[PDB]
Amino acid sequence: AIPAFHPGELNVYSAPGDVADVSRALRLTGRRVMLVPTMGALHEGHLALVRAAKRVPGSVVVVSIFVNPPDDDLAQLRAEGVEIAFTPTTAAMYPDGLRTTVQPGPLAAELEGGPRPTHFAGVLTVVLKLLQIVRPDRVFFGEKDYQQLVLIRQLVADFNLDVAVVGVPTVREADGLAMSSRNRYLDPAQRAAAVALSAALTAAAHAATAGAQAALDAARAVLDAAPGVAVDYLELRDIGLGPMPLNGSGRLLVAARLGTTRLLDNIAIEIG
Amino acid sequence: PAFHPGELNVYSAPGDVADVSRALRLTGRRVMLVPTMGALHEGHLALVRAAKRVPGSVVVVSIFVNPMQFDLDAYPRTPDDDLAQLRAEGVEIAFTPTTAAMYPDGLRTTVQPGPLAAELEGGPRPTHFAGVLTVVLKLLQIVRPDRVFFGEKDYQQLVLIRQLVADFNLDVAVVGVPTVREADGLAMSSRNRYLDPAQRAAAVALSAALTAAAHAATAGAQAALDAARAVLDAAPGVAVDYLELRDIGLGPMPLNGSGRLLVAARLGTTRLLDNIAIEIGT
Ligand SMILES: O=C(O)[C@@H]1COc2ccccc2O1
Ligand SMILES: O=C(O)[C@H]1COc2ccccc2O1
């Protein structure tokens, strides 16, 4: 006997099997279930994911809130017109501890996998779990976390998952700083120098008419002009994060440490 | 793709069985999946029949020698026979993927099983269960059945498959089906064809040892194990890999009153497995 669901209101479920039941019962009456996976502490970047999910005809929006090991977040979802939030406990998600998990391909070891070499296994495992619980038609991820998005596409292809993965463009502050809840930790100096990540990336995107080396040199010059910005990497790759082709579409990714804060950004790049 | 019902439809492309599967489900048929590596025998057909017996069932049997779990060139391949067997059971769908369609990106994203996959069958073959759980996950995602059928012969495999299913929240019921035996007790296996008449006769020691142990078990664990050990020792050219008494989920839990007894042994070059349910004492 299917759990209670009230149209046009924010229905909150904590039990995987509840949200599973409602979702499956909703698809059968012709709603198209959209999944927005989040870790709570919602900002505009999350809201953009929600909005893209809402403009699918017949969409009902599922937003998970789960910290991979509050009333505010729900008021934001309530205010965005979201019908389902899925807010499970660590024990509901992992009732048997860390047992079977997803092992990512070699990409999970590069770039962000450098300092956090198990991070994406964690991410892929929970994403796979969420996809099985909710069974969405479409799943929404921000391009901010670009490597993560490429790995999730890989998970979906690799395990024959029958879901569309949708990548939503990065939401930025007025000066271009990619939104993140870490941005709140930057002191004034750091916050001003932080602009250089997106300025370098945009500078590169336009320098690219002159070829790849010009793009990289433009990005580097800009980063070089900022104080207190320790670049962990600055790399140009193809859109799937393999080696950059001689010309054609690419992606430029950067990561840096400002004090104790690690910021990331990336951007689409055409070569030529 | 076409579906001529009451007939056996063979699809090789993942896409074609996914589409046909979904369509059949959207019309109310209950999709049953029986994954196999072909070279089918009566132990497979009992898996098929359990599936047929579920009402509104449409039966998918998958046949795929998975290069990730492997030795690989030595596996028995008998498709004409396999296919005529399924016609004869009135199986409506055979799913026979190519390696390229299953591994277009080689080994990229794979399943990592729990610590149970390092033990028993997995001790000298630490990657074996990874390949099994990877292809099983993919097959469940392609075919999307209500239920999935496995023999208890490969009991460790069965237990890890239920780990797969619980840990990743798969919305599928796993059905364990009791081991089919030759009239002398020998567990049916595609591997059995590799025993000469001598080894075939010795091979009965495995089920004899287990059934002995199951009845000796009123006298306790040690008696059951000694009973099995005695039978195996009296068998000519049976070399025991392991003989182990475990809890039924095989795991970090102590054996209570209920268990499973597991044996692996070499006859010549052929490895056999068998297992049985043990009740200890009362
Ligand atoms: O043919 C068989 O016995 C095995 C039984 O176990 C299998 C597990 C996954 C995929 C195929 C399988 O085939
Ligand atoms: O809060 C977030 O930004 C997101 C970012 O990506 C996520 C992926 C999987 C589960 C939760 C996630 O939360």
Side-chain angles (χ1 to χ4, degrees), chain A residues 1-23 25-272, chain B residues 1-21 23-70 72-282:
Chain A
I2 284 142
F5 172 77
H6 311 298
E9 260 134 47
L10 179 60
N11 304 261
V12 182
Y13 311 88
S14 286
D18 281 18
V19 93
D21 288 345
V22 179
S23 160
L26 286 168
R27 203 173 189 284
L28 290 191
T29 79
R31 299 289 286 276
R32 292 291 160 274
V33 187
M34 309 286 127
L35 181 62
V36 183
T38 79
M39 301 201 301
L42 306 181
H43 61 58
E44 295 294 320
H46 305 107
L47 299 186
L49 311 170
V50 169
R51 271 147 203 166
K54 273 184 86 82
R55 74 189 131 236
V56 163
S59 73
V60 48
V61 179
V62 183
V63 176
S64 52
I65 301 165
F66 181 60
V67 207
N68 204 26
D71 315 75
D72 191 46
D73 290 322
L74 301 171
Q76 312 207 42
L77 306 175
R78 204 168 276 116
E80 290 296 325
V82 152
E83 293 167 278
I84 301 164
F86 177 42
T87 59
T89 64
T90 291
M93 280 305 270
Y94 293 100
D96 291 286
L98 286 173
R99 197 168 59 179
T100 319
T101 67
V102 176
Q103 157 90 299
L107 182 76
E110 306 186 289
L111 299 168
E112 285 305 288
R116 307 146 92 196
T118 45
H119 161 67
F120 294 122
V123 182
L124 301 202
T125 307
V126 70
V127 166
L128 176 62
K129 290 166 71 36
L130 287 172
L131 289 175
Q132 304 304 327
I133 296 155
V134 176
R135 263 103 54 206
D137 298 78
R138 298 184 210 195
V139 59
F140 290 86
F141 293 98
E143 309 181 331
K144 186 184 177 281
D145 299 301
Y146 192 78
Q147 187 175 19
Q148 153 169 313
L149 174 54
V150 168
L151 290 159
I152 297 180
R153 294 203 190 267
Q154 277 185 11
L155 168 77
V156 160
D158 284 2
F159 291 165
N160 316 86
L161 301 186
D162 179 22
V163 66
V165 175
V166 178
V168 173
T170 306
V171 193
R172 302 167 177 287
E173 323 262 29
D175 64 359
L177 181 65
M179 305 227 205
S180 147
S181 41
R182 291 174 191 186
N183 293 344
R184 79 199 290 266
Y185 297 124
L186 304 162
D187 68 52
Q190 279 164 339
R191 176 60 189 83
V195 68
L197 271 82
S198 57
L201 281 185
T202 55
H206 288 93
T209 54
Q213 195 67 67
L216 280 165
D217 289 337
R220 260 155 216 161
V222 173
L223 293 165
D224 282 343
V229 175
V231 174
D232 284 330
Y233 56 82
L234 165 71
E235 262 181 62
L236 177 56
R237 304 283 201 91
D238 85 26
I239 64 168
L241 297 178
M244 192 49 186
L246 287 152
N247 47 244
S249 295
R251 202 81 183 190
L252 170 68
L253 314 92
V254 65
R257 290 165 307 94
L258 288 81
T260 63
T261 305
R262 212 150 166 290
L263 299 177
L264 340 176
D265 213 346
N266 68 85
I267 203 170
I269 291 269
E270 314 302 320
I271 292 300
Chain B
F3 184 68
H4 324 323
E7 276 192 304
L8 171 74
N9 298 280
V10 180
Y11 311 112
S12 287
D16 295 3
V17 77
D19 289 351
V20 173
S21 180
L24 279 153
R25 192 177 326 112
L26 284 183
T27 95
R29 308 281 305 266
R30 297 201 284 163
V31 175
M32 309 292 110
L33 179 66
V34 187
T36 89
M37 294 214 293
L40 300 181
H41 52 58
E42 197 65 31
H44 296 103
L45 310 184
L47 291 187
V48 160
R49 292 168 198 144
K52 257 207 153 295
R53 117 197 288 82
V54 183
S57 52
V58 65
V59 170
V60 184
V61 186
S62 75
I63 292 164
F64 176 65
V65 177
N66 173 39
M68 203 202 154
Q69 48 184 274
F70 280 86
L72 164 73
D73 289 329
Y75 209 83
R77 298 178 181 74
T78 62
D80 303 282
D81 297 308
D82 292 350
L83 288 188
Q85 304 215 50
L86 306 173
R87 254 151 211 130
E89 296 300 319
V91 165
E92 284 164 295
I93 306 158
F95 178 41
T96 64
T98 66
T99 304
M102 298 289 285
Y103 295 104
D105 286 293
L107 288 186
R108 190 173 57 190
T109 317
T110 63
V111 173
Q112 170 132 99
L116 173 62
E119 294 169 9
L120 299 160
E121 290 298 288
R125 303 171 181 87
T127 74
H128 172 74
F129 289 112
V132 164
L133 302 193
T134 299
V135 73
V136 168
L137 185 56
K138 290 171 51 74
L139 287 183
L140 295 165
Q141 301 309 316
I142 296 166
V143 176
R144 230 81 150 268
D146 292 42
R147 309 182 194 200
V148 73
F149 300 75
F150 298 104
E152 314 180 343
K153 223 282 270 76
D154 300 288
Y155 186 76
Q156 191 181 6
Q157 200 180 258
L158 176 53
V159 171
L160 285 165
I161 290 154
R162 303 194 192 273
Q163 290 179 5
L164 182 62
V165 160
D167 295 344
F168 288 173
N169 303 84
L170 308 184
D171 189 30
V172 60
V174 183
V175 179
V177 175
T179 312
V180 179
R181 295 183 186 271
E182 309 274 9
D184 72 344
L186 184 56
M188 262 164 184
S189 164
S190 297
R191 256 43 188 273
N192 290 344
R193 87 203 49 211
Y194 299 135
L195 305 163
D196 62 39
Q199 286 155 347
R200 169 62 182 82
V204 74
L206 274 78
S207 43
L210 298 183
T211 53
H215 297 269
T218 40
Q222 166 73 70
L225 273 168
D226 290 348
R229 180 42 91 171
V231 173
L232 292 157
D233 290 348
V238 165
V240 178
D241 269 15
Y242 59 76
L243 167 79
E244 277 191 45
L245 186 61
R246 288 189 185 208
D247 174 60
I248 68 153
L250 302 180
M253 36 273 180
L255 163 86
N256 127 69
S258 275
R260 202 83 188 187
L261 184 54
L262 292 90
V263 73
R266 271 154 296 108
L267 280 92
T269 58
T270 312
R271 262 174 106 259
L272 308 168
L273 312 186
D274 205 342
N275 70 90
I276 200 174
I278 306 279
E279 300 93 82
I280 294 292
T282 324

